[PDB]
């Protein structure tokens, strides 16, 4: 049988006592075949699992109470999950002459009533005062059909959202009007829906962080070369001038600051140098990067060469200490 071993690349985490539904990796990830064109071709999908902290694999008995674990096509359903359900799962596809099979881990995770869990929230970034940005409750597709309508309580950190300055809950969507840095942090939705006379809960959290406007965005800003202070002194050249570069936020930015002393900074011989570095984020996450350098022995001639400071982050700008 074609074995793809463990597929740790997709580490799967799901909250305790809540409906999970696990698709089978091989079908679209590795194999090129939907369940449909593979089921029609006489092949059979079979699931096996090894509970973590155990050696031997079991098959899963579907004929069990309230169909707690069920199987639908390439997916296997948990309604709900349990802490015990945690392990390495193996799904298999086989004709008499064929066998592909893959494994993957599944981690059932506990969930304190303030939604503090071992889980990994994604991060949404809203442009500041760029009007509405709506958050959508994620991973909710196909847990229930159109025939049913869920009820989603929203939360900020640990407190239910009822009346807010600019935050409006629209069920499966969260409306942020005029997003202010005041509202940052991990937001949780608890979408609740009934299924066959029992109520199921789904819990997801998105960390939303407000950043600076690309209307405020513009090339680096340097002032340590302002020249209001020229730095002539007895040599005695113990004197170094800073290099302050403030960058307005740019979603994809390449922040690079470099001191250019003679045009070839790369550790010139007369002096013994090492590049030194610093970083600071604002409230709306704009950067200031500052650079200053250190020397072992000092040669009197360097004062007569000028020190220009440049930096480019998606834009190129440059000024000198003079």
């Amino acid at each position: 049988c074609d074995d793809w071993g463990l597929d740790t690349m997709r580490q799967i985490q799901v909250f305790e006592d809540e409906p999970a539904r696990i698709k089978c990796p091989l079908f679209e990830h590795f194999l090129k075949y939907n369940y449909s064109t593979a089921h029609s071709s006489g092949l059979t999908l079979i699931w096996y699992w090894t509970r973590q902290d155990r050696d031997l694999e079991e098959p899963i008995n579907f004929r069990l109470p309230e169909n707690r674990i069920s199987k639908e096509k390439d997916v296997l359903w948990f309604r709900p999950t349990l802490l015990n359900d945690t392990g390495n799962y193996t799904c298999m596809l086989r004709n008499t002459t064929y066998c592909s099979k893959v494994a993957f881990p599944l981690e059932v995770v506990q969930k304190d009533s303030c939604f503090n869990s071992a889980m990994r929230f994604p991060v949404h970034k809203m442009y500041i005062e760029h009007g509405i940005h709506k958050i959508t409750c994620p991973n909710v597709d196909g847990y229930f059909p159109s025939s049913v309508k869920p009820s989603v309580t929203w939360y900020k950190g640990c407190t239910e959202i009822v009346d807010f300055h600019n935050v409006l809950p629209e069920g499966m969507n969260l409306s942020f009007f005029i997003p202010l840095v005041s509202n940052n942090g991990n937001y949780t939705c608890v979408v609740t829906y009934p299924e066959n006379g029992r109520l199921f809960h789904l819990t997801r959290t998105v960390t939303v962080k407000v950043v600076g406007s690309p209307k405020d965005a513009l090339p680096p800003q340097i002032y340590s070369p302002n020249d209001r202070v020229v730095y002539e002194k007895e040599p005695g050249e113990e004197l170094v001038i800073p290099c302050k570069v403030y960058f307005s936020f740019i979603m994809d930015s390449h922040n690079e600051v470099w001191w250019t002393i003679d045009g070839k900074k790369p550790d010139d011989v007369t002096v013994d140098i090492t590049i030194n570095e610093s970083v600071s984020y604002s409230s709306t996450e704009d950067e200031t990067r500052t650079q200053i350098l250190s020397i072992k022995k000092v040669t009197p001639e360097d004062l007569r060469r000028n020190y220009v400071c440049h930096a480019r982050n998606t834009k190129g700008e440059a000024e000198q200490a003079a």
Binding site: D2, D3, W4, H29, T44, D55, P59, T90
Partner: protein, 491 residues
């Protein structure tokens, strides 16, 4: 003796600084050729260059690591030589910088990892690579290429296929792992832009945990049946093993057990309202292969009529029939129908005949008979065969001529007459008249007069005023019948 000839030549490479490049060269010939690697006509001797020979004697790999540029950028040559001749082939290494990586150049998204496998278990080294064009993934072990070129053996090379915006997944699948499989594995991703190596990964081969995976096997296989139509039956199938298998029933192609609900180790198929006969398949599957087993379901009808019976033996009082069963399935027994040819009444029946041959005794000599054969199975009694006509053998007559009379015609002639014997047992071919003046003699010493089939004859040349004793018999082709008791006539 034969000159060197390449069986594997190196191809031009584009690698990345800090990474690895390998060149492969292999030759055959007689004597086995040697290989040297040259650069610009000078034999390589370099701090970053290593040469790895193939164990089988067929080559060398030149491995360069870490790449430096332009230092290593050059044309290199593999030169194969023996005492009969020399041949070289050139190849190029290009080495870029990360600040010159084109968009699309292969990346290692995920690389093989330390893995420890128990001997005889499958070990899979895994790799995730991306690029444009979709890169090929190849594998190295201890600086020599993994030879998977034959997809028959112990080691298999798998590849996921390109749903565009994805990493392409590579697997090095080492079945039936053994100690020699231990070593340092690297996955290599290649496209038209160049080649990138993963970090190396060690494989260890460990002695077994005592727990054993048992292949699936039928604990209670599905046993065949026969039942009347509608007609229900429950056929039980049971498989066991470690791990425990699933059991689905099947009507050959179409699945009978709904897939999303497939029982574990024990599936019993209930067959409501059975109609047509069939083969039913019970498939069981664990992770250690698939097994199968059939249950034969049939409904038998009243047996087809036997083959037309054939007369193979006949006596005067018996007829032996032989026949073909005329049936595909076993027959329990037969019934023989029999009657006189010109009887217009129903056949008499001989029941419970357990073979395909039988001797019908109790018959009369020289008589026409009609026979049929009927087959019977557990279901019941089938239609009769097509009939066979025949005739019992003849015998000598078993009764004397009746009312034998004789009277004087003259002093020298008499008139003898009689009636046909009641038991001729065949065609009367004629009569023999015995007569004498001395009835104390043996009849064979009496005077005799042979006659054909008739009831009266004259006998002359008798001596007058004498008492003549007269006896008459009839004869068939078989022999003489009994003689009538003596009568006397006086001349």
């Amino acid at each position: 003796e034969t000159p060197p000839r390449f069986t594997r030549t190196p191809v031009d490479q584009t690698g990345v600084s800090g990474g690895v490049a390998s060149f492969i060269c292999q030759a055959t010939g007689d004597p086995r050729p040697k290989i040297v690697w040259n650069k610009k006509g000078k034999k390589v001797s370099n701090q970053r260059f290593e040469v790895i020979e193939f164990d089988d004697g067929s080559g060398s790999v030149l491995r360069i690591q870490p790449l430096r540029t332009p230092r290593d950028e050059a044309i290199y040559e593999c030169v194969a030589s023996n005492n009969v001749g020399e041949i070289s082939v050139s190849t190029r290494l290009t080495v870029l910088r990360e600040d010159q990586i084109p968009r699309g150049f292969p990346t290692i998204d995920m690389g093989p990892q330390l893995k420890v496998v128990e001997r005889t278990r499958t070990a899979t080294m895994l790799c995730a690579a991306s690029g444009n064009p979709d890169p090929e993934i190849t594998w190295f072990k201890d600086f020599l290429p993994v030879d998977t070129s034959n997809n028959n053996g112990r080691i298999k090379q798998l590849r996921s296929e390109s749903i565009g915006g994805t990493p392409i997944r590579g697997a090095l699948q080492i079945e039936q792992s053994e100690e020699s499989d231990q070593g340092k594995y690297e996955c290599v991703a290649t496209n038209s832009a160049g080649t990138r190596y993963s970090a190396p990964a060690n494989l260890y081969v460990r002695e077994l945990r005592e727990v054993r995976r048992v292949p699936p096997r039928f604990s209670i296989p599905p046993t065949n049946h026969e039942i009347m139509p509608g007609g229900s039956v429950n056929i039980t199938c049971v498989a066991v093993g470690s791990p425990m298998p699933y059991v689905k029933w099947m009507l050959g192609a179409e699945d009978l057990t709904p897939e999303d609900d497939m029982p574990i180790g024990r599936n019993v198929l209930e067959l409501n309202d059975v109609r047509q006969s069939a083969n039913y398949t019970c498939v069981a599957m664990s992770t250690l292969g698939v097994i199968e087993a059939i249950a034969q379901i049939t409904v038998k009808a009243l047996p087809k009529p036997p083959g037309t019976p054939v007369v193979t033996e006949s006596t005067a009082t018996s007829i032996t029939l032989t026949w073909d069963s005329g049936n595909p399935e076993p027959v329990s027994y037969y019934i023989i129908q029999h009657k006189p040819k010109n009887s217009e009444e129903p056949y008499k029946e001989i029941d419970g005949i357990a073979t395909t041959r039988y001797s019908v005794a109790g018959l009369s000599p020289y008589s026409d008979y009609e026979f049929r054969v009927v087959a019977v199975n557990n279901i019941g009694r089938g239609p009769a065969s097509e009939p066979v006509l025949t005739q019992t053998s003849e015998q000598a007559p078993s009764s004397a001529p009746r009312d034998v009379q004789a009277r004087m015609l003259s002093s020298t002639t008499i008139l003898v007459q009689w009636k046909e014997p009641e038991e001729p047992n065949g065609q009367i071919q004629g009569y023999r008249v015995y007569y004498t003046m001395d009835p104390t003699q043996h009849v064979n010493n009496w005077m005799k007069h042979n006659v054909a089939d008739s009831q009266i004859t004259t006998i002359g040349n008798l001596v007058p005023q004498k008492t003549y004793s007269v006896k008459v018999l009839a004869f068939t082709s078989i022999g003489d019948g009994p003689l009538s008791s003596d009568i006397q006539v006086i001349t």
